[PDB]
Short mmCIF file of C-alpha atoms in Angstrom, two decimals:
data_model
loop_
_atom_site.label_atom_id
_atom_site.label_comp_id
_atom_site.label_asym_id
_atom_site.label_seq_id
_atom_site.Cartn_x
_atom_site.Cartn_y
_atom_site.Cartn_z
CA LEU A 123 4.97 150.55 189.22
CA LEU A 124 3.65 150.06 185.88
CA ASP A 125 1.71 147.06 185.14
CA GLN A 126 4.03 144.44 184.57
CA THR A 127 1.26 141.32 183.59
CA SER A 128 1.11 140.17 180.41
CA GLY A 129 -1.31 140.27 177.68
CA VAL A 130 -3.56 142.49 179.86
CA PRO A 131 -5.74 145.89 178.92
CA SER A 132 -3.59 147.53 181.52
CA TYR A 133 -0.48 147.10 180.11
CA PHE A 134 2.51 149.29 181.17
CA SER A 135 -0.27 151.60 182.83
CA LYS A 136 0.46 154.03 185.52
CA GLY A 137 -1.11 152.99 189.18
CA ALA A 138 -1.17 153.16 192.95
CA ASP A 139 1.80 155.35 194.60
CA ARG A 140 3.75 154.13 197.31
CA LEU A 141 4.82 155.61 200.59
CA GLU A 142 8.46 155.28 200.64
CA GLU A 143 10.29 156.15 204.55
CA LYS A 144 14.10 155.78 204.90
CA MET A 145 15.41 156.35 208.24
CA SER A 146 18.40 157.93 208.78
CA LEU A 147 20.36 158.81 211.52
CA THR A 148 20.64 162.15 213.42
CA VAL A 149 23.28 163.55 216.55
CA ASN A 150 21.36 165.96 218.69
CA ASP A 151 17.86 166.13 216.65
CA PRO A 152 14.98 166.46 219.54
CA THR A 153 12.16 165.74 216.66
CA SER A 154 14.30 162.06 216.13
CA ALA A 155 13.80 158.95 218.67
CA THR A 156 17.18 158.46 220.17
CA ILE A 157 18.90 155.78 220.49
CA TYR A 158 22.22 156.32 222.08
CA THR A 159 23.53 159.15 224.74
CA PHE A 160 27.16 160.01 224.98
CA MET A 161 29.11 162.34 227.01
CA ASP A 162 32.21 163.67 225.71
CA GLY A 163 32.03 160.36 223.80
CA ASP A 164 31.85 158.14 226.23
CA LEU A 165 28.74 155.86 226.32
CA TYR A 166 26.38 156.88 229.25
CA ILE A 167 23.96 153.45 229.51
CA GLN A 168 23.91 150.29 228.04
CA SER A 169 21.02 147.07 227.62
CA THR A 170 21.00 144.03 225.40
CA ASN A 171 17.60 142.89 225.57
CA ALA A 172 14.42 143.97 223.98
CA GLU A 173 13.20 147.34 225.44
CA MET A 174 9.91 148.06 226.18
CA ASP A 175 8.55 151.03 227.77
CA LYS A 176 5.39 149.90 229.56
CA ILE A 177 6.97 146.58 230.72
CA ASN A 178 9.24 149.19 232.24
CA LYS A 179 6.12 150.37 233.90
CA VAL A 180 5.07 147.25 235.13
CA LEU A 181 8.46 145.71 236.29
CA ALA A 182 9.99 148.10 238.50
CA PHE B 213 2.14 113.95 175.50
CA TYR B 214 3.24 115.16 172.89
CA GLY B 215 1.85 118.99 171.56
CA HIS B 216 1.73 121.84 170.28
CA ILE B 217 1.70 125.80 170.80
CA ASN B 218 0.09 127.77 168.25
CA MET B 219 -1.39 130.94 167.87
CA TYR B 259 0.93 137.87 170.08
CA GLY B 260 1.84 138.80 166.24
CA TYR B 261 3.18 141.61 165.31
CA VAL B 262 4.35 143.40 162.17
CA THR B 263 6.99 146.29 162.03
CA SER B 264 10.36 147.31 160.19
CA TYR B 265 12.10 148.38 163.98
CA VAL B 266 13.77 146.39 165.78
CA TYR B 267 12.47 145.61 169.38
CA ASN B 268 14.73 143.09 172.07
CA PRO B 269 12.74 141.87 175.01
CA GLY B 270 13.88 142.35 178.46
CA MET B 271 13.26 139.45 181.08
CA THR B 272 10.31 140.89 182.23
CA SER B 273 8.48 141.95 179.41
CA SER B 274 5.04 140.99 178.38
CA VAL B 275 3.20 140.11 175.21
CA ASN B 276 2.19 143.70 174.17
CA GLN B 277 5.51 145.26 175.25
CA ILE B 278 6.10 144.58 171.27
CA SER B 279 3.61 147.23 170.12
CA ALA B 280 4.99 150.20 172.80
CA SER B 281 8.40 149.68 172.04
CA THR B 282 7.93 150.73 168.36
CA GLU B 283 5.67 153.86 169.63
CA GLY B 284 3.06 152.17 167.08
CA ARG B 285 5.22 151.89 164.41
CA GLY B 286 3.80 148.26 163.38
CA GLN B 287 0.60 146.42 163.35
CA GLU B 288 -0.77 143.66 165.23
CA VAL B 289 -1.25 140.17 162.79
CA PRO B 290 -5.35 140.12 161.58
CA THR B 291 -7.52 137.57 163.51
CA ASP B 292 -6.74 135.20 160.04
CA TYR B 293 -3.73 134.34 161.40
CA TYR B 294 -4.27 133.76 165.05
CA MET B 295 -7.31 131.37 163.25
CA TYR B 296 -5.82 129.46 160.25
CA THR B 297 -1.88 129.29 161.02
CA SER B 298 -2.46 126.51 164.20
CA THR B 299 -3.14 123.77 161.07
CA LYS B 300 -1.56 123.44 157.57
CA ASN B 301 -4.07 123.39 155.06
CA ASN B 302 -5.21 125.29 151.95
CA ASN B 303 -6.28 128.40 153.34
CA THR B 304 -2.84 130.98 153.73
CA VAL B 305 -2.88 134.01 156.10
CA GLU B 306 -1.31 137.12 153.40
CA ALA C 2 -23.31 110.40 198.63
CA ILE C 3 -21.28 108.14 196.44
CA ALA C 4 -21.27 105.08 194.45
CA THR C 5 -18.72 102.34 195.23
CA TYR C 6 -15.52 99.72 193.67
CA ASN C 7 -18.34 97.41 193.01
CA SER C 8 -20.63 99.03 191.10
CA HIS C 9 -17.80 99.39 188.78
CA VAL C 10 -17.49 95.92 188.63
CA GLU C 11 -21.62 95.42 187.99
CA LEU C 12 -21.61 97.99 184.97
CA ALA C 13 -18.34 96.18 183.66
CA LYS C 14 -20.35 92.93 183.54
CA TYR C 15 -23.07 94.76 182.19
CA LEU C 16 -20.59 95.25 178.98
CA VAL C 17 -19.44 92.08 179.10
CA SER C 18 -22.66 90.99 178.98
CA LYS C 19 -23.65 93.21 175.65
CA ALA C 20 -19.90 90.95 173.85
CA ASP C 21 -22.75 89.03 170.91
CA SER C 22 -23.02 92.59 169.53
CA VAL C 23 -19.87 93.55 170.18
CA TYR C 24 -17.51 94.94 167.03
CA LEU C 25 -14.41 95.89 166.65
CA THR C 26 -13.94 98.43 164.29
CA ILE C 27 -11.22 100.33 162.40
CA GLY C 28 -10.96 103.76 160.32
CA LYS C 29 -9.19 106.70 159.22
CA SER C 30 -7.70 105.03 155.82
CA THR C 31 -6.16 108.60 154.96
CA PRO C 32 -2.99 110.15 156.55
CA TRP C 33 -2.27 112.33 159.16
CA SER C 34 -1.09 115.93 158.84
CA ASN C 35 1.94 113.90 160.53
CA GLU C 36 1.82 110.07 160.07
CA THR C 37 4.34 110.69 163.70
CA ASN C 38 2.21 113.14 165.69
CA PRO C 39 -1.79 112.07 165.63
CA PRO C 40 -4.84 114.26 166.71
CA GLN C 41 -6.40 114.10 169.73
CA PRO C 42 -9.81 111.70 170.27
CA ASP C 43 -13.06 113.00 171.04
CA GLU C 44 -14.85 111.35 173.34
CA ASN C 45 -18.57 112.87 172.43
CA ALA C 46 -18.42 110.76 168.90
CA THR C 47 -20.26 108.16 168.26
CA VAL C 48 -18.32 106.67 164.90
CA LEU C 49 -15.09 106.25 163.28
CA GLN C 50 -13.80 108.92 160.12
CA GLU C 51 -12.91 107.06 157.51
CA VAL C 52 -14.86 103.64 158.48
CA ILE C 53 -12.90 100.86 156.97
CA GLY C 54 -15.48 98.57 158.78
CA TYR C 55 -16.24 95.72 162.08
CA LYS C 56 -15.00 92.56 163.41
CA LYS C 57 -16.50 90.75 165.81
CA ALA C 58 -14.82 90.77 169.43
CA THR C 59 -13.16 87.37 169.02
CA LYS C 60 -12.77 87.59 173.07
CA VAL C 61 -14.97 89.87 175.97
CA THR C 62 -13.89 89.91 179.84
CA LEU C 63 -13.50 91.15 182.59
CA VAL C 64 -9.79 91.06 184.33
CA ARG C 65 -7.54 91.88 187.20
CA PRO C 66 -3.28 92.55 187.38
CA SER C 67 -2.07 89.37 187.34
CA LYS C 68 0.32 87.67 190.72
CA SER C 69 2.22 84.50 191.32
CA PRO C 70 1.58 81.66 193.17
CA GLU C 71 -1.90 82.28 193.28
CA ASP C 72 -2.96 83.13 189.31
CA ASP C 73 -0.35 80.16 188.01
CA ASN C 74 -3.03 77.79 187.00
CA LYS C 75 -4.51 80.42 185.00
CA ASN C 76 -4.45 82.03 181.32
CA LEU C 77 -3.16 85.94 181.53
CA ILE C 78 -3.13 88.48 178.58
CA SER C 79 0.02 90.53 177.64
CA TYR C 80 -0.43 93.61 176.38
CA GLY C 81 1.85 97.53 176.43
CA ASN C 82 4.67 95.13 178.30
CA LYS C 83 2.09 95.08 181.39
CA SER C 84 0.20 91.42 182.52
CA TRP C 85 -3.30 90.43 183.72
CA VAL C 86 -5.26 87.41 184.54
CA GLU C 87 -9.13 87.01 183.23
CA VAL C 88 -12.01 86.79 185.54
CA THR C 89 -15.08 84.99 184.83
CA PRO C 90 -18.07 87.42 185.46
CA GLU C 91 -20.23 85.19 188.16
CA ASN C 92 -16.76 85.57 190.18
CA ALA C 93 -15.93 89.64 189.82
CA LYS C 94 -16.98 90.63 193.07
CA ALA C 95 -15.05 87.93 194.81
CA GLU C 96 -11.84 88.93 192.24
CA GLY C 97 -12.49 92.40 192.21
CA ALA C 98 -12.73 92.28 188.32
CA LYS C 99 -13.74 96.37 186.80
CA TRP C 100 -10.94 96.03 183.95
CA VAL C 101 -12.83 95.05 180.65
CA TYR C 102 -9.91 93.18 177.98
CA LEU C 103 -11.56 93.60 174.69
CA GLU C 104 -9.67 91.77 171.21
CA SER C 105 -10.91 91.68 168.38
CA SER C 106 -7.48 90.24 164.70
CA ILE C 107 -8.22 90.96 160.79
CA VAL C 108 -6.06 88.78 158.70
CA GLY C 109 -6.12 89.31 154.35
CA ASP C 110 -9.09 91.13 153.06
CA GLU C 111 -12.02 89.53 154.68
CA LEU C 112 -12.03 93.87 155.68
CA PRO C 113 -10.51 96.40 152.28
CA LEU C 114 -6.44 95.92 152.71
CA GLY C 115 -4.91 100.18 152.66
CA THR C 116 -3.59 101.11 155.85
CA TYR C 117 -5.55 101.56 159.12
CA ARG C 118 -5.10 104.72 162.39
CA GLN C 119 -8.10 104.86 164.24
CA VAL C 120 -9.08 101.93 166.50
CA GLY C 121 -12.22 101.38 168.75
CA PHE C 122 -15.32 99.73 169.60
CA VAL C 123 -19.59 99.56 169.12
CA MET C 124 -22.13 97.79 170.48
CA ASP C 125 -25.44 97.33 169.57
CA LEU C 126 -24.79 97.07 165.79
CA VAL C 127 -27.03 95.02 163.76
CA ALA C 128 -26.16 93.35 160.21
CA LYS C 129 -28.59 93.47 157.35
CA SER C 130 -30.87 91.23 156.61
CA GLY C 131 -29.34 87.96 154.03
CA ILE C 132 -25.86 88.23 156.16
CA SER C 133 -24.68 86.50 159.03
CA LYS C 134 -20.15 86.57 158.93
CA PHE C 135 -18.37 87.83 161.73
CA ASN C 136 -16.21 90.98 159.21
CA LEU C 137 -18.95 93.46 158.00
CA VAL C 138 -17.92 96.33 155.68
CA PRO C 139 -19.93 99.60 156.48
CA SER C 140 -22.67 98.90 153.77
CA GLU C 141 -23.77 95.70 155.46
CA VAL C 142 -24.50 96.88 158.82
CA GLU C 143 -28.14 98.05 159.30
CA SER C 144 -27.65 99.62 163.03
CA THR C 145 -23.91 100.45 164.02
CA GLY C 146 -24.88 100.72 167.18
CA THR C 147 -23.18 103.22 170.17
CA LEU C 148 -19.33 103.28 169.64
CA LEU C 149 -17.94 103.65 173.07
CA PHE C 150 -14.00 103.56 172.71
CA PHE C 151 -11.84 104.49 170.42
CA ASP C 152 -7.97 105.84 170.05
CA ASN C 153 -5.87 107.85 166.90
CA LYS C 154 -2.32 105.79 166.64
CA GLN C 155 0.48 105.48 163.88
CA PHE C 156 -0.57 103.90 161.40
CA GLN C 157 -0.04 100.23 160.03
CA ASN C 158 -0.66 98.45 156.62
CA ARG C 159 -1.85 95.25 155.69
CA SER C 160 -1.98 91.97 153.89
CA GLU C 161 -2.76 87.95 154.53
CA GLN C 162 0.99 87.66 156.24
CA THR C 163 0.00 90.76 158.85
CA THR C 164 -2.49 90.03 162.09
CA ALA C 165 -4.30 93.13 163.35
CA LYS C 166 -4.52 92.08 166.98
CA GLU C 167 -5.40 95.51 167.85
CA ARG C 168 -6.67 95.13 171.47
CA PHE C 169 -7.67 97.39 174.76
CA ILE C 170 -8.00 97.42 178.76
CA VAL C 171 -10.26 99.91 179.61
CA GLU C 172 -11.60 100.50 182.61
CA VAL C 173 -15.34 103.07 183.16
CA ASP C 174 -13.82 104.77 186.82
CA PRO C 175 -9.97 105.01 186.44
CA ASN C 176 -9.57 107.30 189.72
CA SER C 177 -12.00 106.27 192.47
CA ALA D 2 -7.36 103.84 177.84
CA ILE D 3 -10.24 105.16 179.87
CA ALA D 4 -13.88 105.13 179.41
CA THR D 5 -15.94 107.74 177.03
CA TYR D 6 -18.71 110.41 178.19
CA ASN D 7 -21.67 108.50 175.75
CA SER D 8 -20.18 105.18 177.98
CA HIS D 9 -20.82 106.64 181.24
CA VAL D 10 -24.66 107.71 179.34
CA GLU D 11 -25.56 104.21 178.23
CA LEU D 12 -24.32 103.08 181.80
CA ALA D 13 -27.02 104.95 183.59
CA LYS D 14 -29.44 104.03 181.32
CA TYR D 15 -28.45 100.31 182.57
CA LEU D 16 -29.10 101.67 185.92
CA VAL D 17 -32.73 102.88 185.38
CA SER D 18 -33.32 100.02 183.14
CA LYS D 19 -33.18 98.01 187.10
CA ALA D 20 -35.78 100.46 188.40
CA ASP D 21 -38.20 98.01 189.86
CA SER D 22 -35.85 95.63 191.98
CA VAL D 23 -34.10 99.46 193.27
CA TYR D 24 -35.30 99.88 196.84
CA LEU D 25 -34.05 102.57 199.30
CA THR D 26 -32.03 101.37 202.89
CA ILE D 27 -31.52 102.44 206.16
CA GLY D 28 -29.23 101.54 208.66
CA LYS D 29 -27.22 102.36 211.90
CA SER D 30 -29.80 102.53 214.63
CA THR D 31 -26.68 102.63 217.21
CA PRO D 32 -24.79 106.50 217.52
CA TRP D 33 -21.55 106.67 215.89
CA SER D 34 -17.47 107.32 217.58
CA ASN D 35 -18.55 110.31 217.61
CA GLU D 36 -22.38 112.22 216.73
CA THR D 37 -20.74 115.22 215.38
CA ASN D 38 -18.57 113.52 212.75
CA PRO D 39 -20.04 110.16 210.60
CA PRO D 40 -16.65 108.04 210.05
CA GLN D 41 -15.20 108.94 206.25
CA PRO D 42 -17.49 107.26 203.34
CA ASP D 43 -15.17 104.03 203.25
CA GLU D 44 -17.11 102.38 199.41
CA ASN D 45 -15.94 98.97 200.15
CA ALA D 46 -18.52 97.94 202.02
CA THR D 47 -21.28 95.31 201.36
CA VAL D 48 -24.28 96.43 202.65
CA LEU D 49 -25.46 98.83 205.56
CA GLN D 50 -24.61 98.21 209.08
CA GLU D 51 -27.59 97.93 212.37
CA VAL D 52 -29.56 97.16 208.95
CA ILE D 53 -33.86 98.95 209.41
CA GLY D 54 -34.95 97.83 205.86
CA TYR D 55 -35.90 97.98 202.51
CA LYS D 56 -38.27 100.34 200.90
CA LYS D 57 -38.64 100.08 197.16
CA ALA D 58 -38.03 103.34 195.00
CA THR D 59 -40.50 105.86 194.04
CA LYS D 60 -38.54 108.14 191.72
CA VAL D 61 -35.29 106.62 189.17
CA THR D 62 -35.09 108.42 186.71
CA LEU D 63 -32.02 109.88 184.17
CA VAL D 64 -31.57 113.54 184.83
CA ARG D 65 -28.78 116.54 183.90
CA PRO D 66 -28.27 119.83 186.35
CA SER D 67 -30.55 122.59 184.64
CA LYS D 68 -30.23 125.21 182.15
CA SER D 69 -31.46 128.26 180.64
CA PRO D 70 -33.26 129.58 178.23
CA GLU D 71 -34.54 125.98 177.05
CA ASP D 72 -35.31 124.54 180.36
CA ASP D 73 -37.66 127.35 181.16
CA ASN D 74 -40.39 125.98 179.66
CA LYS D 75 -39.90 122.55 182.06
CA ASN D 76 -39.86 120.46 185.29
CA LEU D 77 -37.52 121.65 187.60
CA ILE D 78 -35.90 119.48 190.87
CA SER D 79 -34.22 121.06 193.83
CA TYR D 80 -31.12 118.86 195.11
CA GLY D 81 -27.93 119.29 196.14
CA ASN D 82 -29.05 122.89 197.01
CA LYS D 83 -28.83 123.43 192.98
CA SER D 84 -31.43 122.15 190.38
CA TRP D 85 -31.88 119.80 188.21
CA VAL D 86 -34.24 118.08 185.45
CA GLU D 87 -35.98 114.77 183.87
CA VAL D 88 -35.00 113.06 180.90
CA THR D 89 -35.80 109.80 178.96
CA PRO D 90 -33.91 106.84 177.79
CA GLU D 91 -34.13 107.24 174.25
CA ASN D 92 -32.83 111.12 174.49
CA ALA D 93 -29.78 110.37 176.90
CA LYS D 94 -26.72 110.52 174.05
CA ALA D 95 -28.82 113.83 172.88
CA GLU D 96 -28.54 115.88 176.22
CA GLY D 97 -25.21 114.53 177.87
CA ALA D 98 -27.60 112.44 180.39
CA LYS D 99 -25.25 110.98 182.97
CA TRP D 100 -26.87 110.96 186.12
CA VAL D 101 -29.76 108.99 188.20
CA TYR D 102 -32.34 110.46 190.11
CA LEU D 103 -33.53 108.37 193.12
CA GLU D 104 -35.92 109.06 195.42
CA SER D 105 -37.92 106.56 198.33
CA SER D 106 -40.31 107.46 201.15
CA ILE D 107 -40.86 105.68 204.31
CA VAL D 108 -44.43 106.36 205.31
CA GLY D 109 -44.72 105.61 209.34
CA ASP D 110 -44.80 102.26 210.44
CA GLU D 111 -43.95 100.56 207.98
CA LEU D 112 -40.54 99.48 208.85
CA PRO D 113 -39.15 99.27 212.48
CA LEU D 114 -38.99 102.33 214.14
CA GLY D 115 -35.90 104.21 215.62
CA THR D 116 -32.42 106.20 214.68
CA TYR D 117 -30.99 106.45 211.62
CA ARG D 118 -27.18 107.12 210.00
CA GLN D 119 -27.05 105.34 207.54
CA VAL D 120 -28.76 105.56 203.69
CA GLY D 121 -28.25 103.46 200.66
CA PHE D 122 -29.84 102.25 197.27
CA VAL D 123 -29.79 97.82 196.50
CA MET D 124 -30.98 96.69 193.15
CA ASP D 125 -32.35 92.49 192.16
CA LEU D 126 -33.50 92.74 195.95
CA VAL D 127 -35.65 89.31 195.98
CA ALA D 128 -38.36 88.40 199.16
CA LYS D 129 -39.32 85.69 200.28
CA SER D 130 -42.22 83.61 198.76
CA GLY D 131 -45.72 84.62 199.93
CA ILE D 132 -44.50 88.12 200.51
CA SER D 133 -45.10 90.91 198.21
CA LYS D 134 -45.57 94.09 200.25
CA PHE D 135 -42.80 97.27 199.38
CA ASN D 136 -41.75 97.50 202.71
CA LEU D 137 -39.17 94.82 204.27
CA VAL D 138 -36.99 94.01 207.36
CA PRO D 139 -33.95 91.95 206.85
CA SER D 140 -35.64 88.57 208.13
CA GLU D 141 -38.62 88.93 205.18
CA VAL D 142 -35.70 89.37 202.48
CA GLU D 143 -34.30 86.09 200.30
CA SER D 144 -31.78 87.78 198.85
CA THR D 145 -30.47 92.02 199.54
CA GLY D 146 -29.21 92.30 195.96
CA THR D 147 -26.54 94.76 195.31
CA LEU D 148 -26.05 98.26 197.52
CA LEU D 149 -24.94 100.45 194.77
CA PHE D 150 -25.03 103.74 196.25
CA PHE D 151 -24.58 105.02 200.03
CA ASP D 152 -24.03 107.93 202.52
CA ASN D 153 -23.08 108.56 206.02
CA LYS D 154 -25.06 111.41 208.06
CA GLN D 155 -26.04 112.77 211.63
CA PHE D 156 -28.34 110.97 212.92
CA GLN D 157 -32.38 110.85 211.90
CA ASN D 158 -34.85 109.32 214.02
CA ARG D 159 -38.73 107.89 213.17
CA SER D 160 -41.93 107.98 214.51
CA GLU D 161 -45.31 106.09 212.95
CA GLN D 162 -46.28 109.58 211.87
CA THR D 163 -43.01 110.34 210.14
CA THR D 164 -42.92 110.64 205.82
CA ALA D 165 -39.05 110.20 206.11
CA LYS D 166 -37.72 110.76 202.66
CA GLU D 167 -34.01 110.58 201.40
CA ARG D 168 -32.74 110.60 197.80
CA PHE D 169 -29.62 111.21 195.43
CA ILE D 170 -28.01 112.31 192.73
CA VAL D 171 -25.50 109.97 191.10
CA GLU D 172 -23.29 109.70 188.21
CA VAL D 173 -21.48 106.13 187.22
CA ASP D 174 -17.92 107.44 186.98
CA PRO D 175 -18.16 110.23 190.34
CA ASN D 176 -15.30 112.26 190.08
CA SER D 177 -14.74 112.04 186.00
#
């Protein structure tokens, strides 16, 4: 993140930080965004094409 | 298209090894200031052969 | 607004109409810092370094690039491995001739012997009272006029056995 | 090799020396292909389309862009949304004045009434014998001379009452 522009007064000087948002996998975490649901390790529902909540609400 | 690249200069007793992303002035930082930039005269007078040597 | 290719033809005709006042000049009689790699020229200058002298331009004419069969009856100019054809002022717009060819020759000591490196052209030159010859050393000139064009070559050296047949092809707009 | 800055200056001095033979001309009295977008400036044209006529130049001089403090004590010309200043022929090589300023005005009905879309300057224009007025239609002109400079515009119009003014700043090598 330090300035690496050659030949400037702010060379190697500290600057803006960065917000890093790393995604991680979880089981029965209510805060997480659910992607799959299982019963006794069998898959509960399928889909293949791209999901969109408000398109379900229009089309159904 | 024939041409010359003439005068950063830095004097030190410490060994500097540049990296792939090293800028011009990293020599002074890597030496903890245990050295000096060459005088202005080095940039002005070493661009041609004449009687004006930079010491 | 825009100028035109025909303006470059007319300004070439103007330079060619001045021919009686036009001399080749040569200079830089002492070495470069290294004779193989000369320094760059200065288009704001009006005289050569170390001026050796002036020789009246033996030939001042318009030209255009040559082609066959339709230039076969004409006369052709060869330089820098390129080959060109001559054009007269009253035909210049019809032929499209916006390039000027400038040539002079020196043989023996009729200008001072030694090496030469700078090469160029002057116009509106005036010779001193009592002199009318076409080879002039700078002491024989009342006004040098305007140095238009010059270059910084690698050197050559001279005697009666050598001809200083230096020339340019020049254009007043290279990028219309 | 290519030309030099002080050659552009001597060639601008030539164009200023012709001034008495210099006329504005205006043309293209019917529409373009699209009146929101005139056709591109194809410089290879010999004279303007649908020619309305000719008027003698009211101003012809060398100029350069103005600069401060040294022009704070001098005249100002507003052109091209920017500021320019006057230069005399004997100062041209000192000031670096390679630009020519050109202006003329048609005062009312002294040329045919109607629309126009093309503007330019001609030199060496010659009227028919017994005609000495500064305003000429194409049937009064014995030789049109040479069209030096022009521009393509969205349509203008005129009346007996309009002072219609057209003007340029130009240099001989228009993108040096």
